[PDB]
Amino acid sequence: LRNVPPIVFVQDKGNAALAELDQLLAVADFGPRD
């Protein structure tokens, strides 16, 4: 790009929620074949 504005690095907060939900769904009991 001919001109790039200042770059700010922001932490992506949303992905952590999905990661935690996945680490929980891994160990969950859902019932008999359902």
Place this chain on the structure above:
RNA sequence: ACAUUUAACUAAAACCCCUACGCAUUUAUAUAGAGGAGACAAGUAAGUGUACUGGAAAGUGCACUUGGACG
């Protein structure tokens, strides 16, 4: 281009040329028409030179500058 006569027992008389200027030359004024300047009135950074496109506004190509940015 153009030319020395009379007179002279004291001394005098006589004297007269033709060519230029124009459909030339210089500057100026008036006038058809055309065109300017001024006044009034109301994301691609920025430039220089040059070139093309476009009715314009502008866009793009090549080289150059920081009189920009890069915590």
